[PDB]
């Protein structure tokens, strides 16, 4: 249900192919891109203020020396801790190759 013109109705808790309101977000946008835009924006914009709160909310823990990295190594580190191993690639290659 996470691609295409499907949408989400949060009162029904169910995926509709018709948009619940006029101003609504597709499922891919609301479940995949939106947290991705929020992860990268909290990292590059708010490493000092509110990256600790966001890393708590995702469950990721970083040491004190890791938070002292510059933005590009820090972002690579946070995304390695969030996405983990590249199993989606391996699934894609197992199922279809």
């Amino acid at each position: 249900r996470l691609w295409g013109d499907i949408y989400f109705n949060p009162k029904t808790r169910k995926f509709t192919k018709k948009a619940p309101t006029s101003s609504s977000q597709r499922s891919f946008v609301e479940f995949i891109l939106e947290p991705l835009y929020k992860i990268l924006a909290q990292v590059v914009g708010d490493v000092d203020t509110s990256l600790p709160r966001t890393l708590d909310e995702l469950g990721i823990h970083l040491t004190k020396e890791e938070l002292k990295l510059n933005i590009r190594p820090l972002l690579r580190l946070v995304c390695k801790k969030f996405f983990g191993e590249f199993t989606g690639f391996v699934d894609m290659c197992v199922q279809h190759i």
Partner: protein
């Protein structure tokens, strides 16, 4: 001791904004296509001169069929730039030649003039494109906003020139920060007079010679002259105005 610093990101954006008169407006490297160090090294080794670039002393200092002129199809001339770019193809004898970086993909980064726009915005420079879940689950990071006030600035610092691109570092010596090195590492602007145009070439020349001749520092037994002086009873120590000390230096030399 003043040896290490670490700054927050509003500090870095304020400093980056206040320093922009001295800084470059390039985001990627492709501006220096045949104007990088490696091009200048190759050019020096082949005794050829890129039109804006420095000129050096040459490094190297029969009837034949292979060189004959009846066999040549002169379609375009071979410029000197081509011989810098593909040095093994267009040169007989390339000695001490460096291969240059081929290409880096274009940074399509979009500057924001006005802060009242959202951070994530479709700029008019961009060409237009054209089963049940539990009640507890939500999208990840549903509480947090998409962007803050700091977001456009924080993205702006990713594509900034050094030392702006960092959060922390070691303090540097004041003299060791030239502040104009980037101005002569670019092309001389158009329409400038001859003396200024030549000036640019000489500054690049010295830049290329320091980069060639560099060998890494020899690990030696350091000695400290002033610590030896302060260990004696003959040297006392104090705190003075710079002008006061300067006057003393002038008087003592006399």
């Amino acid at each position: 001791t003043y040896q290490r610093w670490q700054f927050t990101l509003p500090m870095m954006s304020t400093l980056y904004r206040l320093a922009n008169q001295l800084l470059t407006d390039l985001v990627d490297d492709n501006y220096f296509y045949l104007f990088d160090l490696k091009a200048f090294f190759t050019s020096k080794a082949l005794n050829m001169a890129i039109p804006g670039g420095p000129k050096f002393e040459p490094l190297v200092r029969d009837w034949n069929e292979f060189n004959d002129i009846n066999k040549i199809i002169i379609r375009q001339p071979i410029r000197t730039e081509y011989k810098i770019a593909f040095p093994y193809l267009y040169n007989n004898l390339p000695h001490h030649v460096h291969l240059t970086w081929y290409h880096t993909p274009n940074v399509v980064f979009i500057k924001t003039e006005d802060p009242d726009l959202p951070a994530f915005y479709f700029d008019p420079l961009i060409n237009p494109i054209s089963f049940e879940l539990p009640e507890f689950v939500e999208p990840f990071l549903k509480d947090t906003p998409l962007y803050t006030d700091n977001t456009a600035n924080g993205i702006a610092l990713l594509w900034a020139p050094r030392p702006f691109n960092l959060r922390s570092g070691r303090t540097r010596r004041a003299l060791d920060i030239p502040l104009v090195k980037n101005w002569y590492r670019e092309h001389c602007p158009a329409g400038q007079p001859v003396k200024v145009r030549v000036s640019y070439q000489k500054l690049l020349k010295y830049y290329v010679l320091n980069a060639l001749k560099h060998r890494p520092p020899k690990a030696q037994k350091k000695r400290y002259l002033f610590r030896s002086f302060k260990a004696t009873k003959f040297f006392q120590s104090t705190k003075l105005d710079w002008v006061e000390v300067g006057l003393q230096v002038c008087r003592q030399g006399y």
